[PDB]
Every structure is written in C-alpha cells, then in structure tokens.
Amino acid sequence: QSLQTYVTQQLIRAAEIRASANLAATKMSECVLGQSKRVDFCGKGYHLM
Amino acid sequence: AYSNNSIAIPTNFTISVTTEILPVSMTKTSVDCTMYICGDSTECSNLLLQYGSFCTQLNRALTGIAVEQDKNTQEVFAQVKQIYKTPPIKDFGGFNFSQILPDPSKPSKRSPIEDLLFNKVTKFNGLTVLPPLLTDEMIAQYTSALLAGTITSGWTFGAGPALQIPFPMQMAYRFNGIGVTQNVLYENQKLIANQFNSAIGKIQDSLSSTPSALGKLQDVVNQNAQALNTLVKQLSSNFGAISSVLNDILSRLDPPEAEVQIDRLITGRLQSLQTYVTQQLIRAAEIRASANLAATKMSECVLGQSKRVDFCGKGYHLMSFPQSAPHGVVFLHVTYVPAQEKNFTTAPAICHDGKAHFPREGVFVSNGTHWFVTQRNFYEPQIITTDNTFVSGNCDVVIGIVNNTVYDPLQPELDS
Amino acid sequence: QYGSFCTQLNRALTGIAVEQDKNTQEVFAQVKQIYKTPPIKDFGGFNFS
Amino acid sequence: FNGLTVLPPLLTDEMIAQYTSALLAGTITSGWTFGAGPALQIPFPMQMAYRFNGIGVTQNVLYENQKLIANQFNSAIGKIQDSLSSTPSALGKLQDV
Amino acid sequence: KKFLPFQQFGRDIADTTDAVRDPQTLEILDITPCSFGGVSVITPGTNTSNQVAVLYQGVNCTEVPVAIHTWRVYSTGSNVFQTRAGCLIGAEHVNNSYECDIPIGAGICASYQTSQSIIAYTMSLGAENSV
Numbered sequence A: 001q002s003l004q005t006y007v008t009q010q011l012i013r014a015a016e017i018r019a020s021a022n023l024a025a026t027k028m029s030e031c032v033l034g035q036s037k038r039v040d041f042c043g044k045g046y047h048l049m
Numbered sequence B: 001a002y003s004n005n006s007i008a009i010p011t012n013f014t015i016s017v018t019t020e021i022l023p024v025s026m027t028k029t030s031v032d033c034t035m036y037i038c039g040d041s042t043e044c045s046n047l048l049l050q051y052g053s054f055c056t057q058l059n060r061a062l063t064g065i066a067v068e069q070d071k072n073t074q075e076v077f078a079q080v081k082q083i084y085k086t087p088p089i090k091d092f093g094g095f096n097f098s099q100i101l102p103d104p105s106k107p108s109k110r111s112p113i114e115d116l117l118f119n120k121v122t123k124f125n126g127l128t129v130l131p132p133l134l135t136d137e138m139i140a141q142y143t144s145a146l147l148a149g150t151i152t153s154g155w156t157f158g159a160g161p162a163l164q165i166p167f168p169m170q171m172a173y174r175f176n177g178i179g180v181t182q183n184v185l186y187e188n189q190k191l192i193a194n195q196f197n198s199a200i201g202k203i204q205d206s207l208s209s210t211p212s213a214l215g216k217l218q219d220v221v222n223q224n225a226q227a228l229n230t231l232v233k234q235l236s237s238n239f240g241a242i243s244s245v246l247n248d249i250l251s252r253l254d255p256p257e258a259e260v261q262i263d264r265l266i267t268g269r270l271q272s273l274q275t276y277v278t279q280q281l282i283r284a285a286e287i288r289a290s291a292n293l294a295a296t297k298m299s300e301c302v303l304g305q306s307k308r309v310d311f312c313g314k315g316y317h318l319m320s321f322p323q324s325a326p327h328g329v330v331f332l333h334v335t336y337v338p339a340q341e342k343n344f345t346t347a348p349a350i351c352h353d354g355k356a357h358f359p360r361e362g363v364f365v366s367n368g369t370h371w372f373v374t375q376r377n378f379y380e381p382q383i384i385t386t387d388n389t390f391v392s393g394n395c396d397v398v399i400g401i402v403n404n405t406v407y408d409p410l411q412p413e414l415d416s
Numbered sequence C: 001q002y003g004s005f006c007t008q009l010n011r012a013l014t015g016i017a018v019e020q021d022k023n024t025q026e027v028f029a030q031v032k033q034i035y036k037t038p039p040i041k042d043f044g045g046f047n048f049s
Numbered sequence D: 001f002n003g004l005t006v007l008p009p010l011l012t013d014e015m016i017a018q019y020t021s022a023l024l025a026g027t028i029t030s031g032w033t034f035g036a037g038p039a040l041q042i043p044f045p046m047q048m049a050y051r052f053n054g055i056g057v058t059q060n061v062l063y064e065n066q067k068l069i070a071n072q073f074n075s076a077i078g079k080i081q082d083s084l085s086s087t088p089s090a091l092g093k094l095q096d097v
Numbered sequence E: 001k002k003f004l005p006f007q008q009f010g011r012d013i014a015d016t017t018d019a020v021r022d023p024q025t026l027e028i029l030d031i032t033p034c035s036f037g038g039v040s041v042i043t044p045g046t047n048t049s050n051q052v053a054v055l056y057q058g059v060n061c062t063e064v065p066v067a068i069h070t071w072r073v074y075s076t077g078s079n080v081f082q083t084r085a086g087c088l089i090g091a092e093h094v095n096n097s098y099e100c101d102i103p104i105g106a107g108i109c110a111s112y113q114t115s116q117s118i119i120a121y122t123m124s125l126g127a128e129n130s131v
C-alpha cells in the first residue's frame, strides 16, 4: 500500500512537471527565437527580445 | 561571419511540407464491478455489499472518462457551421490537391493519405467497450468540409460568411502576410506550384515508407490494451487464498472459512480494480491535454495564418491542412524557407543634402559600387527615391551614415 | 501470489524516468547547429559580458 | 540503500551550457532568422531597429538614441546579478520541487 | 477448429479457455460466454413527458425478452430497433436527420416529438452548403 501511494504521487508530480516543461518549450520557441506580440507572455511591457 | 556593416539577403525560396501527429481520443470502456469481482455467485455479493458504494465510484469515474473522450473529439473536429464541398472543376492555377481531397472511387470517402494512415495503424469478464458517438465517416466529412472551405475561401469562412476568392490571390495574401510582396508570387507562380506538388508527393512517399512516424498514435492503443490484459490476469491469482477459482473453494469448504477465503479474494480484486481506475484517470487527463493542444492548433494553424514562431511547422508559416487518423489528427504544414543567401555591405542611413534618409520598408544594400533598397526576405534592388525613404534629423547624430544621391522622380517631369 | 503489481509499478517508474529526458531534450534541443560568437565583441556599445 | 537508485541524466550540464551558448550566439549575430532557415549575419543596431519597428516605433528613434539605449541596457543587465544574489528566496520554484 | 489427437481444450486468447473436446463424442465445441451489458434509460425532461426508451448496450435483440428475471418489454411494445450500440426499445426510426438532441452512440441520436413519442435518427453534421 505504501509503495502504491508513493508511485501515484510521483505520477501526479511528473504530470505537473511535464506541463511546466511544455510551457518552457513554448516560451523558448516564441520569446527567444522571435518577437512575440502577445501581452505579458514574455514579460510586462512591450517585448523587445 | 559577423561584422558591423555586412548583411546576408536570400535570393531564392523553397516551399516545404511537414507533418505533425496528435492523439485525440482514447477507447471508452466500462467494467461491471460485481461481475468482475465474482461470477454467478450469491455469497460473493452478500459478502461484498458490506463495502459500500465503491462500485458507484468506479462507474462514475469511467462514465466521466467516456463523456470526456466524446467532448474531446467534438471540440477538436466540429469547428465549422456548414458542410462545404469543392466544385468538380480542378483548376487552381497550377496547384494540385489530388492527394488530400476525398476520392469518390474508393468505397469509403477518404483521401489517399487518410487511407495510408488508416492502413498503417493496427472481453467476457464484465468489461465492455462502448462505440464512439462520431463514426469514421462523420469525421471524414468534417475534414473534407474544412479542407474545401480552406481551399475555396481562405480564412474568411472561419470568422463569418464564406467568401470565394481565387487561389493565387489567397497565395498573395499569405505571402504579404509573411512579409514578401505579391509580385514575387505573381511572377514565380509556376515554380511555386511545381514545388508544392513535389513536396506533397515527397510527404506521401515518406509516410508510406515507414510507420514509425505514427508511433505516437500506435503506442496509445497498446497502452490501453495492456491496461486491460493485465486486469484479466489479476483474476488468476490466489491473493494468499487456497485457490484462485471461486467455484472450487465455494463448493469445497463450509461457510465459516470459505467466507474468510472469499474476503481475501475480494480484497485482492478490489485493489486491482482501484489501480486500474486510477491509471485510466491519469491517462485520460494526459489525453485531454493533448486533445486541447490539437484543438488549438486546428483553430489557429488551419482557420488562419499564425504568426507564432515554430507553432505550425518550422519556418515562416503559410497554411496547414488537416487529416484524420484512428484516435488522432495529422496536420500537414505548408511553410516557406529562404534558400540562397548573398553578402552585401550595409548602412543604417544615407546623407543627401545635410539630412538623413531612412528606409520605409526595406534595407539599404550596396553591391560595392551603387546603393539600392530591398525587402528583408528576398533580394530585389530598386533605385533610391524620395518615396522609398523618409527624412528626419541631420547627418551628424546617426553612426555609420554613408554618402549617396537620392533621386527625385518629380524633377525630370518638372524639367520636361 | 499477488500477481503482477510491482512489475507495473516498475514500468510506471521507468516511464517517468524517460519522460524526464524527453522534457529536457524538447526544452533545449531546438537548434540544429552550434553557432559561435566572433572573437571581437564589437556590438556598437552593447555589453554581453 | 533499500532498492532505490538515481539514474544520471542523459544530458550532462556542460551540454546544456553549450546549447544555451549556441542559442545566445545565434540570437545575437543573426536576429530571428536562424529560427526559420539558414542564419544570416546582420549588425546588432539594425536588429534593434527591426524590433523597434516591430513594437510600433520608427527606427530613427533608436538610430538617434543608440548610446542612451546602450547605457540603459548595460545598467539593467548589471542590476540583475544584485537582484538575484541579494534575495536568497529568488530560486524558490526549483528548490520547492 | 482442428485439435491434435492429444489435445482437449484450447486457449486462443491465451488467458482463458474457449474451445473443448465434446464429452458425448469426438467433436469439438467452442464456448462463448453468456451475454450481458448495461441498461440505459433515455428520457426527455421529466416535467415534459413520461414516455421513455430503454437501451440494452451491446446485445442483439433476439435475446432481450426472455433472459432477465419488475417491468417487462413485450415484442409488440415497440418496433425493437437494432442499433450498432445495442438493442433499443420504445422508439421508432425516422429517415430524416437533425441535430444530436441526445447522444446514443455510433452516430445515432434520439429526440422527443409529439407512433412513439421518442424517435431515433442518424445525426446530421449540419446544413449542406456550396460556395
């Protein structure tokens, strides 16, 4: 029972980290390799780089 | 080779077609609790009813999962109010969509690429599989309507009434969108059409060559199937009891000890069911996230032209086309890539008569003897006139200014 | 006698382990080559030290 | 020591540093072109003028305020080290996980 | 099937037995587990009407009236439609197609109209248009 609970908690945490990694990848693709026009997606104010 | 007064400007372009594959839905299953725990036995149920409403919890979870799968498919595909159809005429100024439009010859209305995808992708213990609400023909018709609307109306049909427009004019629209003037397409239409057809043929050949690219979909099916098989295997274990078969222990021993044996078996099987349900819930959450991503891509990449970098394929984005697949969607992204670059010397401004001229849209380039103005993604020199440039300031503030003569088109007419 | 519990537990753990490397590769490996800055830092007054 | 192991990551940290350095060099010497296709050299002030036109300001503003913009950028980049080191709770997100 | 002379039963699915040698004589009989499935009740708003329909999920209609041991079904009680999702009792069949009022499955949707009060049809994806 203890091992099963630990494994389930690890799975949930891994899903959360996957979501964060996807967000980081999108931010890298758009904010770094370009000049995003989305508001507050790459920091407050008009985005330069 | 970085330097403070040197740039590289492309002189040619390539049209590329890439693919992206996204799973959307997962097989809807529902497991009868009492039938799985025990088969044709009253003592099982009488001992089981002490455990409360766990069966209701399991059934609620599975029903929610199935309804969410249906909602995922409906949200991803049903994005058009009408059902358009391409006219029988196949004149598009050179472009050829025979590999993506539906083929009436085949018994099932599908494009050749859809059939290629479909042919590349491959029970009695209370578990049942429910059919999806939307069959394959419905999603095929949805994809056909989306493709026909994209071909015959551009992006205007995604915001309001569909408006017809010739395909070369839509091509010029997209080219002006990415930052290249219309004359480039209107003068290289034949080359662009040939490259588009070649790219479509290449992607067909590449997809037909290997099935590993479809693994994203294929894996999913395996996972679900495995999560079923293991479950049935759990019915062949004693869980610390005398025998894994309920009938033999029931017919062998008297109530006051057969009951403890049955309690052991019930505990084990309930643990197995809980594990299966939790795994299904987590996998359903992941699939839902993927389906939401697919819906966003369909809404932005297909129904319009996306300015987000590396969102609808590598390079500057021109359009995309959708295709169906078992439990998934495949996007064909059509993008633009600069091909051949040339070196040029550069200056940020030009001093003419004590004033600085700045380019309106374009860059100043010198081939070593003269100065011209071009666009920023295709070499096209032009004489520097007062209409390509605007005047502001003096000749001593900017750093790196250069001396040249700015031509005035009004003066020769005035002299004449 | 308990069947195949810890085998699937191990499978889930290795799945998470693979997802970690997948996340890192997706986030960082977005460039096909490896560019290098010129030896002289002549950027018109800007400083990138 | 009771049946648990930690598997070293596939990518060593030096590889990550090299990747980030490559990205930085590309975005410094070629603007945003290396994302789409082949990298094309372009002077940095011209790239800044490109971005200024992108956010809706004509490029003469930068070409006449270059030195002031450079000084402000240098000061802002300098302040980041102090703003990070001085506060020991800045990195809480990673320490939490 | 064909069993080798030394074989008695077979396990094609590889976890359960589905074939056996005949006990009376030397033939071979296959075994299919007895049918079952969920029962769903399809109804409009209860304060609109009381007529309902019953959907036995995933089972042929040549079977519903006589197995279960309460309300009864009666063959004349409806047309007993046969859908890909299962056996449907209490609703008619209409060739026309409308929006999916109630999701049944496999492209079949049910609705209420004032001849049984409940009808089942093939869903219409939308009004056809040509540009």
Ligand SMILES: *[C@@H]1O[C@H](CO)[C@@H](O[C@@H]2O[C@H](CO)[C@@H](O)[C@H](O)[C@H]2NC(C)=O)[C@H](O)[C@H]1NC(C)=O
Pocket (backbone or CB within 6 Å): B011, B012, B013, B191, B194, B195
């Ligand atoms: C731009 O590139 C395209 C192909 O990348 C060139 O088109 C080819 O041109 C050669 C000769 O120049 C022909 O033999 C090929 O048949 C052409 N390909 C196709 C598909 O038609 C094009 O000439 C290049 N343009 C410039 C100005 O260099």
Ligand SMILES: *[C@@H]1O[C@H](CO)[C@@H](O[C@@H]2O[C@H](CO)[C@@H](O)[C@H](O)[C@H]2NC(C)=O)[C@H](O)[C@H]1NC(C)=O
Pocket (backbone or CB within 6 Å): B090, B096, B097, B098, B099
């Ligand atoms: C679009 O391309 C297809 C090739 O995929 C063309 O189909 C060929 O048509 C010719 C003449 O009808 C046949 O001899 C070939 O066997 C066909 N090939 C295939 C693979 O079907 C089609 O004609 C092209 N359409 C247009 C308008 O150019």
Ligand SMILES: *[C@@H]1O[C@H](CO)[C@@H](O[C@@H]2O[C@H](CO)[C@@H](O)[C@H](O)[C@H]2NC(C)=O)[C@H](O)[C@H]1NC(C)=O
Pocket (backbone or CB within 6 Å): B367, B368, B369, B370
């Ligand atoms: C730089 O471009 C200019 C403008 O085209 C070139 O000058 C012309 O060269 C052609 C030869 O291809 C002559 O026929 C024209 O008469 C020239 N223009 C004038 C006004 O005389 C120049 O040769 C180019 N330089 C280089 C190194 O390519």
Ligand SMILES: *[C@@H]1O[C@H](CO)[C@@H](O[C@@H]2O[C@H](CO)[C@@H](O)[C@H](O)[C@H]2NC(C)=O)[C@H](O)[C@H]1NC(C)=O
Pocket (backbone or CB within 6 Å): B351, B401, B402, B403
């Ligand atoms: C561009 O041309 C102007 C004039 O044609 C140059 O201005 C000269 O600058 C020098 C250095 O201060 C003076 O000695 C001359 O008297 C100036 N000329 C005139 C007519 O006043 C200017 O230097 C040139 N710039 C470049 C980059 O070549």
Ligand SMILES: *[C@@H]1O[C@H](CO)[C@@H](O[C@@H]2O[C@H](CO)[C@@H](O)[C@H](O)[C@H]2NC(C)=O)[C@H](O)[C@H]1NC(C)=O
Pocket (backbone or CB within 6 Å): C041, C045, C046, C047, C048, C049
């Ligand atoms: C960029 O800024 C750094 C400081 O962050 C400068 O490095 C300093 O250089 C001076 C000499 O000019 C030394 O006296 C300092 O000790 C250096 N500081 C450090 C922290 O090393 C660097 O010179 C600047 N470069 C440019 C091109 O502006």
Ligand SMILES: *[C@@H]1O[C@H](CO)[C@@H](O)[C@H](O)[C@H]1NC(C)=O
Pocket (backbone or CB within 6 Å): B006, B343, B344, B345
């Ligand atoms: C780079 O540009 C310069 C012009 O400043 C030119 O002389 C040189 O040949 C170019 N290099 C190549 C490899 O074409």
Ligand SMILES: *[C@@H]1O[C@H](CO)[C@@H](O)[C@H](O)[C@H]1NC(C)=O
Pocket (backbone or CB within 6 Å): B004, B005, B399, B400, C042
């Ligand atoms: C460019 O760099 C060279 C150094 O080789 C220098 O002599 C020249 O003045 C610089 N020009 C500009 C506009 O920065």
Ligand SMILES: *[C@@H]1O[C@H](CO)[C@@H](O)[C@H](O)[C@H]1NC(C)=O
Pocket (backbone or CB within 6 Å): E045, E047, E048
């Ligand atoms: C329930 O009754 C009210 C008033 O009697 C009526 O307005 C409403 O439409 C009824 N519900 C439905 C689903 O028709």
Ligand SMILES: *[C@@H]1O[C@H](CO)[C@@H](O)[C@H](O)[C@H]1NC(C)=O
Pocket (backbone or CB within 6 Å): E060, E061, E062
């Ligand atoms: C029940 O109906 C299905 C419809 O597909 C048919 O395939 C099957 O043979 C039928 N069974 C009997 C016993 O009539």
Ligand SMILES: *[C@@H]1O[C@H](CO)[C@@H](O)[C@H](O)[C@H]1NC(C)=O
Pocket (backbone or CB within 6 Å): E093, E094, E095
């Ligand atoms: C209309 O429905 C009847 C069954 O009630 C069927 O026999 C007939 O073929 C249908 N006609 C059309 C045009 O679908």
